[PDB]
């Protein structure tokens, strides 16, 4: 689990969104595994606006932050899971790293701020849903 809190927005994995998230919905995209809801309190995270390919992510199944090299956001085939059939997920970046299903939501960050959140994985790979192109998260 986990979320990004920027401005009056909460960014979560679409497959982990709560009823309160759906009842306060701003935007959702199943192909990206992302959902954004509105919040009453202002958050403290800043979004990275860059092309970094190295950063650090939080892995809840290890209680550790790991430095990683990750691919550019792309259209990647993701195996069937409890939440989606086997399909292509867009704006996904892959890295070598430990992940388990409940690791979704962990933040990947670089020197500029938050880059995205854990969304996929298995067999020593971890995939992150990018948020750097969502410029509207910085305003309103
Ligand atoms: C850290 S994810 C992971 C790790 C180990 C094994 C399996 C997984 C993938 C689990 N997933 C991927 C999500 C998606 N974005 O399609 C939906 C879901 O249930
Ligand atoms: Zn950066």
Curated annotation (Swiss-Prot):
Residues forming the catalytic site: 15 (for protease 2a activity), 33 (for protease 2a activity), 104 (for protease 2a activity)
Catalysed reactions, semicolon-separated: Selective cleavage of Tyr-|-Gly bond in the picornavirus polyprotein
Disulphide bridges, residue numbers: none
Residues engaged in binding Zn(2+) 1: 50, 52, 110, 112
Superkingdom as given in the UniProt entry: Viruses
Annotated function: Cysteine protease that cleaves viral polyprotein and specific host proteins. It is responsible for the autocatalytic cleavage between the P1 and P2 regions, which is the first cleavage occurring in the polyprotein. Also cleaves the host translation initiation factor EIF4G1, in order to shut down the capped cellular mRNA translation. Inhibits the host nucleus-cytoplasm protein and RNA trafficking by cleaving host members of the nuclear pores. Counteracts stress granule formation probably by antagonizing its assembly or promoting its dissassembly.
Assembly with partners or alone: Homodimer.
Protein's recorded name: Protease 2A
Record organism: Coxsackievirus A16 (strain G-10)
Residues of the full protein shown: 869 to 1008 of 2193
């Amino acid at each position: 689990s986990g979320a990004i809190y920027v401005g009056n927005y909460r960014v979560v994995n679409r497959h982990l969104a709560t009823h309160n998230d759906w009842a306060n919905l701003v935007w959702e995209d199943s192909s990206r595994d992302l959902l954004v809801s509105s919040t009453t309190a202002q958050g403290c995270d800043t979004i990275a606006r860059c092309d970094c390919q190295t950063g650090v992510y939080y892995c809840s199944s290890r209680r550790k932050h790991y430095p990683v090299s990750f691919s550019k956001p792309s259209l990647i085939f993701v195996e069937a899971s409890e939440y989606y059939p086997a399909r292509y997920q867009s704006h996904l970046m892959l890295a070598v790293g430990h992940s388990e299903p409940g690791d979704c939501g962990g933040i990947l960050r670089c020197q500029h701020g938050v880059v995205g959140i854990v969304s996929t994985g298995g067999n020593g790979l971890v995939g992150f849903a990018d948020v750097r192109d969502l410029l509207w998260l910085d305003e309103e």
